[PDB]
Design a protein around this motif. Structure first.
Motif, PDB file in Angstrom:
ATOM      1  N   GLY A   1      35.495  43.395  37.983  1.00 47.90           N
ATOM      2  CA  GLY A   1      35.836  44.307  39.055  1.00 47.90           C
ATOM      3  C   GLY A   1      36.746  45.434  38.594  1.00 47.90           C
ATOM      4  O   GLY A   1      36.781  45.816  37.421  1.00 47.90           O
ATOM      5  N   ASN A   2      37.490  45.971  39.553  1.00 51.62           N
ATOM      6  CA  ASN A   2      38.409  47.077  39.325  1.00 51.62           C
ATOM      7  C   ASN A   2      39.808  46.681  39.800  1.00 51.62           C
ATOM      8  O   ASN A   2      40.065  45.528  40.156  1.00 51.62           O
ATOM      9  N   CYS A   3      40.713  47.655  39.808  1.00 53.54           N
ATOM     10  CA  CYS A   3      42.132  47.410  40.025  1.00 53.54           C
ATOM     11  C   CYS A   3      42.534  47.397  41.495  1.00 53.54           C
ATOM     12  O   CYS A   3      43.697  47.109  41.796  1.00 53.54           O
ATOM     13  N   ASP A   4      41.619  47.695  42.414  1.00 55.69           N
ATOM     14  CA  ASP A   4      41.983  47.894  43.810  1.00 55.69           C
ATOM     15  C   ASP A   4      41.954  46.620  44.644  1.00 55.69           C
ATOM     16  O   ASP A   4      42.347  46.662  45.814  1.00 55.69           O
ATOM     17  N   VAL A   5      41.512  45.498  44.087  1.00 53.86           N
ATOM     18  CA  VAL A   5      41.330  44.268  44.853  1.00 53.86           C
ATOM     19  C   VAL A   5      42.447  43.268  44.587  1.00 53.86           C
ATOM     20  O   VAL A   5      42.994  42.678  45.518  1.00 53.86           O
ATOM     21  N   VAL A   6      42.798  43.064  43.318  1.00 58.10           N
ATOM     22  CA  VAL A   6      43.757  42.024  42.967  1.00 58.10           C
ATOM     23  C   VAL A   6      45.133  42.380  43.512  1.00 58.10           C
ATOM     24  O   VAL A   6      45.563  43.540  43.464  1.00 58.10           O
ATOM     25  N   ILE A   7      45.830  41.376  44.035  1.00 56.08           N
ATOM     26  CA  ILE A   7      47.185  41.532  44.553  1.00 56.08           C
ATOM     27  C   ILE A   7      48.159  41.143  43.451  1.00 56.08           C
ATOM     28  O   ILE A   7      48.111  40.019  42.938  1.00 56.08           O
ATOM     29  N   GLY A   8      49.043  42.066  43.088  1.00 58.60           N
ATOM     30  CA  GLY A   8      50.020  41.819  42.050  1.00 58.60           C
ATOM     31  C   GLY A   8      49.600  42.237  40.661  1.00 58.60           C
ATOM     32  O   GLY A   8      50.301  41.910  39.697  1.00 58.60           O
ATOM     33  N   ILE A   9      48.480  42.949  40.524  1.00 55.45           N
ATOM     34  CA  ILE A   9      48.036  43.375  39.206  1.00 55.45           C
ATOM     35  C   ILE A   9      49.040  44.361  38.620  1.00 55.45           C
ATOM     36  O   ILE A   9      49.704  45.116  39.342  1.00 55.45           O
ATOM     37  N   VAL A  10      49.142  44.364  37.296  1.00 58.22           N
ATOM     38  CA  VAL A  10      50.106  45.187  36.579  1.00 58.22           C
ATOM     39  C   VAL A  10      49.373  45.940  35.483  1.00 58.22           C
ATOM     40  O   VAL A  10      48.525  45.368  34.791  1.00 58.22           O
ATOM     41  N   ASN A  11      49.669  47.228  35.333  1.00 60.36           N
ATOM     42  CA  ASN A  11      49.102  47.950  34.204  1.00 60.36           C
ATOM     43  C   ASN A  11      49.775  47.585  32.887  1.00 60.36           C
ATOM     44  O   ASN A  11      50.986  47.357  32.817  1.00 60.36           O
ATOM     45  N   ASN A  12      48.953  47.538  31.843  1.00 62.36           N
ATOM     46  CA  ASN A  12      49.306  47.293  30.451  1.00 62.36           C
ATOM     47  C   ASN A  12      48.072  47.563  29.610  1.00 62.36           C
ATOM     48  O   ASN A  12      46.958  47.235  30.021  1.00 62.36           O
ATOM     49  N   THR A  13      48.275  48.165  28.445  1.00 57.78           N
ATOM     50  CA  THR A  13      47.159  48.422  27.547  1.00 57.78           C
ATOM     51  C   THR A  13      46.617  47.111  26.997  1.00 57.78           C
ATOM     52  O   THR A  13      47.374  46.183  26.701  1.00 57.78           O
ATOM     53  N   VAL A  14      45.295  47.033  26.873  1.00 55.41           N
ATOM     54  CA  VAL A  14      44.615  45.868  26.318  1.00 55.41           C
ATOM     55  C   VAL A  14      44.043  46.268  24.967  1.00 55.41           C
ATOM     56  O   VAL A  14      43.171  47.142  24.885  1.00 55.41           O
ATOM     57  N   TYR A  15      44.529  45.624  23.911  1.00 59.73           N
ATOM     58  CA  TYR A  15      44.120  45.972  22.558  1.00 59.73           C
ATOM     59  C   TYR A  15      42.658  45.614  22.327  1.00 59.73           C
ATOM     60  O   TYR A  15      42.156  44.613  22.846  1.00 59.73           O
ATOM     61  N   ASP A  16      41.970  46.444  21.547  1.00 63.27           N
ATOM     62  CA  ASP A  16      40.571  46.213  21.209  1.00 63.27           C
ATOM     63  C   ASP A  16      40.459  45.854  19.733  1.00 63.27           C
ATOM     64  O   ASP A  16      40.692  46.720  18.876  1.00 63.27           O
TER      65      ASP A  16
ATOM     66  N   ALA B   1      39.932  45.339  35.914  1.00 67.54           N
ATOM     67  CA  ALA B   1      40.819  44.187  35.962  1.00 67.54           C
ATOM     68  C   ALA B   1      40.462  43.205  34.854  1.00 67.54           C
ATOM     69  O   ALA B   1      39.297  42.823  34.698  1.00 67.54           O
ATOM     70  N   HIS B   2      41.471  42.801  34.087  1.00 71.31           N
ATOM     71  CA  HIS B   2      41.334  41.835  33.008  1.00 71.31           C
ATOM     72  C   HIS B   2      42.016  40.538  33.417  1.00 71.31           C
ATOM     73  O   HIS B   2      43.128  40.558  33.957  1.00 71.31           O
ATOM     74  N   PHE B   3      41.353  39.415  33.154  1.00 75.23           N
ATOM     75  CA  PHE B   3      41.905  38.100  33.439  1.00 75.23           C
ATOM     76  C   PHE B   3      41.879  37.253  32.178  1.00 75.23           C
ATOM     77  O   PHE B   3      40.981  37.407  31.349  1.00 75.23           O
TER      78      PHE B   3
ATOM     79  N   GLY C   1      35.833  24.282  38.368  1.00 81.12           N
ATOM     80  CA  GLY C   1      34.743  24.961  37.698  1.00 81.12           C
ATOM     81  C   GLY C   1      34.369  26.309  38.268  1.00 81.12           C
ATOM     82  O   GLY C   1      33.212  26.722  38.126  1.00 81.12           O
ATOM     83  N   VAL C   2      35.301  27.009  38.908  1.00 80.70           N
ATOM     84  CA  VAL C   2      35.063  28.337  39.461  1.00 80.70           C
ATOM     85  C   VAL C   2      36.021  29.308  38.789  1.00 80.70           C
ATOM     86  O   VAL C   2      37.217  29.024  38.667  1.00 80.70           O
ATOM     87  N   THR C   3      35.494  30.449  38.354  1.00 80.58           N
ATOM     88  CA  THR C   3      36.314  31.440  37.672  1.00 80.58           C
ATOM     89  C   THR C   3      37.428  31.935  38.587  1.00 80.58           C
ATOM     90  O   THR C   3      37.238  32.099  39.794  1.00 80.58           O
ATOM     91  N   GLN C   4      38.601  32.174  37.998  1.00 81.61           N
ATOM     92  CA  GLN C   4      39.776  32.537  38.784  1.00 81.61           C
ATOM     93  C   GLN C   4      39.671  33.926  39.400  1.00 81.61           C
ATOM     94  O   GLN C   4      40.397  34.220  40.358  1.00 81.61           O
ATOM     95  N   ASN C   5      38.809  34.793  38.866  1.00 82.33           N
ATOM     96  CA  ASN C   5      38.625  36.100  39.484  1.00 82.33           C
ATOM     97  C   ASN C   5      38.131  35.961  40.914  1.00 82.33           C
ATOM     98  O   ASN C   5      38.442  36.802  41.764  1.00 82.33           O
ATOM     99  N   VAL C   6      37.375  34.902  41.204  1.00 79.44           N
ATOM    100  CA  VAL C   6      36.905  34.676  42.568  1.00 79.44           C
ATOM    101  C   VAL C   6      38.089  34.588  43.521  1.00 79.44           C
ATOM    102  O   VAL C   6      38.135  35.272  44.552  1.00 79.44           O
ATOM    103  N   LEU C   7      39.072  33.754  43.183  1.00 75.80           N
ATOM    104  CA  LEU C   7      40.255  33.640  44.027  1.00 75.80           C
ATOM    105  C   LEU C   7      41.052  34.935  44.025  1.00 75.80           C
ATOM    106  O   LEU C   7      41.497  35.403  45.077  1.00 75.80           O
ATOM    107  N   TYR C   8      41.259  35.530  42.853  1.00 71.22           N
ATOM    108  CA  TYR C   8      42.086  36.729  42.817  1.00 71.22           C
ATOM    109  C   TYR C   8      41.447  37.889  43.567  1.00 71.22           C
ATOM    110  O   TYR C   8      42.139  38.864  43.877  1.00 71.22           O
ATOM    111  N   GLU C   9      40.153  37.805  43.868  1.00 74.48           N
ATOM    112  CA  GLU C   9      39.481  38.827  44.657  1.00 74.48           C
ATOM    113  C   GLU C   9      39.326  38.455  46.124  1.00 74.48           C
ATOM    114  O   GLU C   9      39.221  39.352  46.966  1.00 74.48           O
ATOM    115  N   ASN C  10      39.308  37.162  46.457  1.00 77.36           N
ATOM    116  CA  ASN C  10      39.137  36.720  47.837  1.00 77.36           C
ATOM    117  C   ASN C  10      40.403  36.092  48.416  1.00 77.36           C
ATOM    118  O   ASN C  10      40.340  35.427  49.455  1.00 77.36           O
TER     119      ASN C  10
END
Ligand SMILES: *[C@@H]1O[C@H](CO[C@@H]2O[C@@H](C)[C@@H](O)[C@@H](O)[C@@H]2O)[C@@H](O[C@@H]2O[C@H](CO)[C@@H](O[C@@H]3O[C@H](CO[C@H]4O[C@H](CO)[C@@H](O)[C@H](O)[C@@H]4O)[C@@H](O)[C@H](O[C@H]4O[C@H](CO)[C@@H](O)[C@H](O)[C@@H]4O)[C@@H]3O)[C@H](O)[C@H]2NC(C)=O)[C@H](O)[C@H]1NC(C)=O
Ligand SMILES: *[C@@H]1O[C@H](CO[C@@H]2O[C@@H](C)[C@@H](O)[C@@H](O)[C@@H]2O)[C@@H](O[C@@H]2O[C@H](CO)[C@@H](O[C@@H]3O[C@H](CO)[C@@H](O)[C@H](O[C@H]4O[C@H](CO)[C@@H](O)[C@H](O)[C@@H]4O)[C@@H]3O)[C@H](O)[C@H]2NC(C)=O)[C@H](O)[C@H]1NC(C)=O
Ligand SMILES: *[C@@H]1O[C@H](CO)[C@@H](O[C@@H]2O[C@H](CO)[C@@H](O[C@@H]3O[C@H](CO)[C@@H](O)[C@H](O)[C@@H]3O)[C@H](O)[C@H]2NC(C)=O)[C@H](O)[C@H]1NC(C)=O
Ligand SMILES: *[C@@H]1O[C@H](CO)[C@@H](O[C@@H]2O[C@H](CO)[C@@H](O)[C@H](O)[C@H]2NC(C)=O)[C@H](O)[C@H]1NC(C)=O
Lengths: 48, 72, 22
Positions: free
Chosen positions: B45-60, B8-10, A25-34
């Motif tokens: 958040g932004n793009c500087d934290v996630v490890i392995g993030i990849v750029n790609n356009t996100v359709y609106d 960052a989009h998840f 029940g915790v959003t995955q952004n938490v892990l992807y940031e920590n």
């Protein structure tokens, strides 16, 4: 957990932990940031 | 995750996959690709934290409606 | 699909902008 239900399906361990976090029940952004903190805590716990 | 505009989009529920040239978001237990839109994903958040993030356009989805609204 | 039925599906966005048109 895929190998326990059928053929083993590979998945990066970070993404697997994200799935588990979603499970508890915790959003995955938490892990992807920590990720660094979680990894350090897990390693320290194993050492303990 | 996905980098679109410095944000960052998840996936809301699912996982990001790529066939080799383009990116999609699909449910984990059955492959049915979907276009990565703001409805499939949530920003955090932004793009500087996630490890392995990849750029790609996100359709609106609202963008074409806005374009038509501007036109007529 | 088997058993699908015909019905209008209201779109909330459309009236919001349509009223702005007038
Ligand atoms: C939902 O309604 C369907 C009937 O009306 C259709 O769906 C609604 C929502 C509207 O979009 C409307 O515009 C649609 O037509 C119903 O299934 C439907 O079955 C009818 C056939 O009885 C299909 O109508 C098609 O009409 C075109 C053009 O009409 C002329 O030609 C036909 C030839 O049969 C004549 O019968 C007419 O009197 C007109 O002279 C035809 O080209 C077409 O013929 C063939 O293609 C359809 C494709 O579905 C087949 O069903 C037919 O049996 C023929 O093989 C049709 O006659 C209509 O296309 C079809 N719609 C759908 C979505 O299947 C449906 O049961 C309702 N509920 C649902 C889908 O859950
Ligand atoms: C990885 O996926 C991307 C995105 O497309 C995806 O795959 C397609 C095969 C199809 O299933 C899509 O629905 C799906 O989202 C691929 O790159 C895009 O898709 C195609 C190539 O696959 C190309 O653009 C166009 O895509 C249309 C929709 O699929 C397709 O119909 C077009 O075909 C052209 O020719 C036919 C026949 O003459 C004609 O009917 C069409 O109207 C069109 O002129 C055309 O292929 C681009 O590559 C990308 N287009 C997008 C995103 O809009 C990518 O190919 C795939 N990876 C590999 C290695 O193939
Ligand atoms: C995804 O896109 C972002 C932003 O475009 C990438 O960040 C990269 O870093 C800088 C910052 O905008 C961009 O310019 C760079 O500037 C530095 C400092 O001047 C310079 O040393 C670099 O050579 C570069 O010119 C860069 O264009 C930008 N894009 C990249 C590296 O592709 C981010 O890295 C991209 N990530 C992925 C997975 O594609
Ligand atoms: C659900 O059952 C109905 C009938 O109860 C089905 O419609 C047909 O209706 C006639 C009535 O004369 C029956 O003779 C047919 O046997 C029925 N067809 C079938 C396959 O049962 C209908 O097909 C079913 N539809 C759904 C679930 O959407």
């Amino acid at each position: 957990w895929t190998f326990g239900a059928g053929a083993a399906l590979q998945i990066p361990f970070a993404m697997q932990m994200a799935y588990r976090f979603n499970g508890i029940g915790v959003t995955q952004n938490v892990l992807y940031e920590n990720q660094k903190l979680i990894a350090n805590q897990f390693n320290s716990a194993i050492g303990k | 995750a996905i980098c679109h505009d410095g944000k960052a989009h998840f996936p809301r529920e699912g996982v990001f996959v790529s066939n080799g040239t383009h990116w999609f978001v699909t449910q984990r237990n059955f492959y049915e690709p979907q276009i990565i839109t703001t409805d499939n994903t949530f920003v955090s958040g932004n793009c500087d934290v996630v490890i392995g993030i990849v750029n790609n356009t996100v359709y609106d989805p609202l963008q074409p409606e806005l374009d038509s609204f501007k036109e007529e």
